[PDB]
Design a protein around this ligand. Structure first.
Ligand SMILES: NC(=O)CC[C@H](N)C(=O)O
Length: 237
């Protein structure tokens, strides 16, 4: 009975190493948003706000870096054509940073300017006590998925980012973004947890593991790993 399933050890290690890569990837990028939010606290004048958002280290980092203020003032670099009714305080990155009260990440949404799926690192900007706005920075979803799948598999498996309640955040399949884990596998579903789960894909049988992304205070995000069950048993010696 050679039913030794190290596959179980492989999935839960690849899941944590991938989670650590995403954990380390957001390190510097959250650091850039915080340093910007802390700098706009001591001076948020329009001339200083303009030149603060034009530094090249933010240009090569985020698609858009911006500050939405409590009175509705909006400043963003690079400049883009936004809807006429654009109000930053009614945007998800404003509510996410406000409701979280700290540096947080938004669920993927549709960029209004370039019409591409993005994620925002939004941090509240406070002069101490009362806040005056929210600093944000957009990350292209195609860039994020590549970090999720930085580790190589044998074409048997892929990695994706799913939230705690089961909402898929980034997935290599562009149409399955923001779908629920229940919406993907109709036959009764896997659930986030320690255990491995077995479900069926489109003409394929998959095994799923879940390793949480630590370090993100307040965000219970998990790195999911679907692997082709039959393909997964590549035996050695
Ligand atoms: N032009 C911009 O800076 C857009 C900001 C961001 N994409 C938003 O959803 O508001």
């Amino acid at each position: 009975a050679s039913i030794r399933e190290d596959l179980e050890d492989y999935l839960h290690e690849m899941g944590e190493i991938t989670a650590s890569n995403v954990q380390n990837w957001l390190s510097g990028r959250i650091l850039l948003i915080e340093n910007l939010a802390q700098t706009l606290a001591r001076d948020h004048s329009p001339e200083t706000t303009q030149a603060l958002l034009e530094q090249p280290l933010l240009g090569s980092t985020f698609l858009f870096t911006y500050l939405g203020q409590t009175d509705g003032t909006y400043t963003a670099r690079p400049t883009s054509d936004l809807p006429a009714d654009y109000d930053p305080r009614r945007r998800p990155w404003y509510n996410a940073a406000t409701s979280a009260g700290q540096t947080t990440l938004t669920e993927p949404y549709m960029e209004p300017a370039i019409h591409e799926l993005v994620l925002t690192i939004a941090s509240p900007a406070r002069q101490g006590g009362q806040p005056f706005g929210v600093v944000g920075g957009d990350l292209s979803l195609q860039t994020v998925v590549k970090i999720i799948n930085s580790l190589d598999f044998g074409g048997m498996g892929y990695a994706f980012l799913v939230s705690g309640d089961g909402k898929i955040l980034v997935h290599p399949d562009k149409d399955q973004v923001m779908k629920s884990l229940s919406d993907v596998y109709p036959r009764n579903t896997p659930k986030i947890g320690s255990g491995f789960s077995e479900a069926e894909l489109h003409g394929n049988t998959r095994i799923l593991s879940f390793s949480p992304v630590k370090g993100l205070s307040g965000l219970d995000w998990y790195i999911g790993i679907s692997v082709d069950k039959d393909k997964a048993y590549a035996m050695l010696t």
